[PDB]
Amino acid sequence: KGLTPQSQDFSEWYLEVIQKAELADYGPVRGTIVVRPYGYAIWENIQQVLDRMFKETGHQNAYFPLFIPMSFLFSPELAVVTHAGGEELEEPLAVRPTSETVIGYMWSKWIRSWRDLPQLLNQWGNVVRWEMRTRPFLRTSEFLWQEGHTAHATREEAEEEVRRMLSIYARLAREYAAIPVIEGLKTEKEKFAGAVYTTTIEALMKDGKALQAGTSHYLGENFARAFDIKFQDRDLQVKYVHTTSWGLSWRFIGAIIMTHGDDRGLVLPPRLAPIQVVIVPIYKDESRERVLEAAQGLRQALLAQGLRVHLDDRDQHTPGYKFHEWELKGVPFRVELGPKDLEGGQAVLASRLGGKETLPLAALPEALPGKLDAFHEELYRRALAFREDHTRKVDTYEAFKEAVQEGFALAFHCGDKACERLIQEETTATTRCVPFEAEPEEGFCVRCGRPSAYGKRVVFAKAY
């Protein structure tokens, strides 16, 4: 049964492609998924890219415990261990929803003077925050992610870190996933309760809904006061540190799926694709030797170019099967190398985006790199256009209701939480972010008509 078209039922389309492209599958325990190889490889590329960016910026990876003192934290989001070692634990243990509490404790003892700062920490791994609504890569009790935490001697240095990390996520989205995003502040209502403020990158999925792709919080001294994290400054005065926190999960994979995916399956951005180019040799007993030899030569030639190429010479499947599979899995480029074309020293180069062409094998190594970039460029261009066509300035609550039905709605807002929640209660739409950079404007709240706040229009939308 072919893939349900996006125009017919996006939600179902989403669930089916994750299944058909073999990204994930449902685990025995309700609410849990099994991330398959192909899907995991996408997460690995995302991790490698972020890790380099984190490292170049001084952060270091560490590993805080999976089990957290219940005393240090009953709460619906927690999965609690009550039995272990063949007995009831006098002290039940919570599975970490995040490592912040343990981090705060360790920082309390590790940080003593300005010499101990900054503290630039990151951790890759799983966390658990119980969820009733199951949905692959979007909402699951357990998921993988990366959460960073930093401590600084001054406020300035911390706020700079906050933006530094958000820009890293924005770069990941733009330069690597070709996903357009808006950088800005969450409103008081939408921010993390414990942060002075929360910055975010908001993306628009092909179904017109918004998805938060990354977050970076400025915690001020809130976290430091809570865990008694202080240091002796150069002026001998004892002060609390200024901290930040930022995370990005495999929800990003969902963002990639719903941003570039089409009715034929996945379309992965070249710079995060586990396989940028797949070679599918076609032959018969007679032409086996010649074809595979040429297929392998091309494989090496592409590897030498630093490209992630895969030679699918599997005997357990037919060419028709392979082509269909690699299409579903969104491989940017496919190379059909058959006996006939091979005589002419050529092969067929197909683009997941559409179109094919016969070219000489020798020219392929030198051309693919530029083509991959072009492929990336096209994905971004198309995504930008979609966003443009699905973003609308609104001055009336009537036009607002129409706008949040198709995508982004740029509207004035009074800045009142109550007015903001009312809009959500009536339209289900939420404020996604007050962008850092946008046309400066002054007006009146799209809902209550009172003077507009923020000095610009706020981005609203129905969100994931």
Next chain:
Amino acid sequence: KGLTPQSQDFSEWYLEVIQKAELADYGPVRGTIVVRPYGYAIWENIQQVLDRMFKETGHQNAYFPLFIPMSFLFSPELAVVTHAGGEELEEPLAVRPTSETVIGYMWSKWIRSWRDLPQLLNQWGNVVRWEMRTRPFLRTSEFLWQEGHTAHATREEAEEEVRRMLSIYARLAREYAAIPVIEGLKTEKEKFAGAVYTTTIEALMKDGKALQAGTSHYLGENFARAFDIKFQDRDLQVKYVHTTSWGLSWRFIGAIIMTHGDDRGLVLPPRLAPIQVVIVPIYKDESRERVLEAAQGLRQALLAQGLRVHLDDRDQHTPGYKFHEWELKGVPFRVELGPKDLEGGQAVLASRLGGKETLPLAALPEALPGKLDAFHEELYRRALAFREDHTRKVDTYEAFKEAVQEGFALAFHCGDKACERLIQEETTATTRCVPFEAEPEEGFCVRCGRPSAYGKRVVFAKAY
């Protein structure tokens, strides 16, 4: 004050070095630890090396859920979740002690014919096996590791996979950690219960006790039958798959500490050491510019050589302090770069293995790589010498009791589980493995006297 000497109290020396070298610290939960950046970096290196080796052999990474249905398995080793989402669960969940059961379940559905074979999976991550003791990188309820799982169409292909992965573990040990190991089979008593047989690599620590560094099991059809994992072969006949299993945890880090460490602290193998060379610039105000410029020049030159070099320009610590820290942390080489020697175009190269030599700065970059290799070779050589000195062939149960007090005891054994458990109850020593490459010998059980089995002497020792 120094570290408790190894000969004074090995165990206390162990805990102290981990603490002092900042490999790990203690978390709020009695039993949970925190792996610091320097300690984590070692694991990251082990992971990269193993990952490359698994990848080149066709394996692929995946991610199975943390929680497993209790029905798939309260055994004291298990940590059980009975409360989640603010409510008490009807079906108690187990935190994975291994993903084997969920993998078996998924394979049951994914595997249908020969086209789905072979299955070559691996997973990096945490698992939990309750431990009352708490020794970082040796015995902890929660730990990180890698566990591989494969499904094959034939017994021959499965058994080959088993030895392929053991050899990979042996290569990591020998070629990367400079840790000598003995490859062999576990006895029936020591093998994994659900396995036809268990292979392993056994290392000897500096305290004369043996340590299982890694294992690879041939599960035959036991696993397939238990989880109903079968396939339609080319001959249209439905058959059970043959599976293998293999794992290696950061316990491997403890092996490194106890194999090469000394009274001065850690001694990291060059090929796994986060920092292979550390540059310590010594200077004054009038020579600060010249030195640092020379240091940075050497830094770059070494990086250009592909070496993991670190420049410790921290001006808040005396050169002595630095020398001590990098020695404690086991950095292979330390370059002392000062005013006087620099004028001569030279610097002092200090080896963690002992000794110094003044060499021309210009020749260093080209020489270090080869020196690191010799350093590695020396580490291995010493460990081999140690093993030879702590290994002894015994023909009497008297000589056996002496040998297993110092290290390895090469004795004949009848092969009876009963006799084997007796030797353990009487000496605490266990069989480590029946070595693959062991001189063929026939004799009589070192304890009961009955005719010897295995056609060779069995390795015995007190073990971790």
